[PDB]
Amino acid sequence: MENFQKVEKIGEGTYGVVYKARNKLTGEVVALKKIRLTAIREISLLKELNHPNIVKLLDVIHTENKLYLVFEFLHQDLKKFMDASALTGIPLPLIKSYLFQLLQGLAFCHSHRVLHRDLKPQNLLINTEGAIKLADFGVTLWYRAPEILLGCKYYSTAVDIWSLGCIFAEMVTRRALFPGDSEIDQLFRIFRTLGTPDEVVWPGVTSMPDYKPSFPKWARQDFSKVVPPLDEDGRSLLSQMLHYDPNKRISAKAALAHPFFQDVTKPVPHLRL
Numbered sequence: 001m002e003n004f005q006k007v008e009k010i011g012e013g014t015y016g017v018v019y020k021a022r023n024k025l026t027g028e029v030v031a032l033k034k035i036r037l038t039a040i041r042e043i044s045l046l047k048e049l050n051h052p053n054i055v056k057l058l059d060v061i062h063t064e065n066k067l068y069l070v071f072e073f074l075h076q077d078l079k080k081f082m083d084a085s086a087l088t089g090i091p092l093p094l095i096k097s098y099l100f101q102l103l104q105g106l107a108f109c110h111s112h113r114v115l116h117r118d119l120k121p122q123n124l125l126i127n128t129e130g131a132i133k134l135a136d137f138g139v140t141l142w143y144r145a146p147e148i149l150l151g152c153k154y155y156s157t158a159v160d161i162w163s164l165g166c167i168f169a170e171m172v173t174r175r176a177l178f179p180g181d182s183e184i185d186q187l188f189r190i191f192r193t194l195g196t197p198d199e200v201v202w203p204g205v206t207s208m209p210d211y212k213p214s215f216p217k218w219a220r221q222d223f224s225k226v227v228p229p230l231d232e233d234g235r236s237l238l239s240q241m242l243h244y245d246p247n248k249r250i251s252a253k254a255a256l257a258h259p260f261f262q263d264v265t266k267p268v269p270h271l272r273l
């Protein structure tokens with residue numbers, strides 16, 4: 001750990017603080033996650049999870065009551081980019097590219113039974129090359145899947161698809177889709193837009209740990225009202241990413257074959273660093 005010089009604090013990650021740091025021998029600029037404290041075996045496996053759309057775990061340093069994770073560094077997160085793009089909005093071709101690449105990263109994760117669990121614009125990283133990467137995996141509730149909010153203990157890869165749908169919508173409209181500030185408010189914001197789920201659209205839902213028969217019964221809103229000005233292909237894909245039933249929610253693999261991605265390209269973003 002004495003091999004690393006702090007450049008600056010990036011922020012709080014899931015299990016500790018992330019810093020931009022430099023390796024004193026090589027000169028490598030990295031993102032160093034300091035975890036404060038079988039997990040060692042779990043992380044060892046994460047090091048093998050290599051993909052162009054996953055931030056590279058370079059090294060794991062287990063020294064003391066201390067665990068440091070040395071990751072690849074990227075210059076910007078998607079939230080910052082969205083914020084900087086808020087006057088014009090991110091161009092649709094760039095939205096489409098970012099969505100497509102994230103679905104590739106997730107299809108890869110998911111094929112290895114690895115879930116992200118906490119996808120949000122603040123943990124999606126971009127570079128000048130036009131790439132976007134999944135990071136900070138292996139409180140904001142805005143992106144949480146409804147099965148989690150309803151107390152599912154053993155949730156599935158479908159949770160990441162839900163989160164990515166919310167992010168997709170947000171890139172298009174320049175507004176957070178479901179900006180809740182408590183679990184119930186989050187849940188009720190979802191219910192008010194998509195309709196209160198019942199046994200018809202989500203078999204099993206009334207059986208969930210925190211489902212209450214006494215939940216208000218709201219009607220589904222018209223979907224063309226939710227994400228203007230997204231085209232029919234985009235709205236169709238989004239609706240499949242936001243299905244209530246986790247088992248009917250589209251997989252990352254199937255989403256990549258959606259007609260929305262017929263004309264996908266890889267634009268370069270204009271980043272001010």
Ligand SMILES: COc1cc[nH]c1/C=C1\C(=O)Nc2ccc(F)c(C#C[C@@H](O)[C@@H](N)[C@@H](C)O)c21
Pocket residue numbers: 010011012013014017018031033055071072073074075076077122123125135136137
């Ligand atoms: C604000 O986040 C930025 C901006 C540039 N890079 C990052 C983050 C990481 C980077 O470059 N490599 C990484 C490897 C594992 C990582 F977990 C990260 C990360 C992250 C973030 O979720 C938190 N540090 C923030 C949101 O508070 C990063």
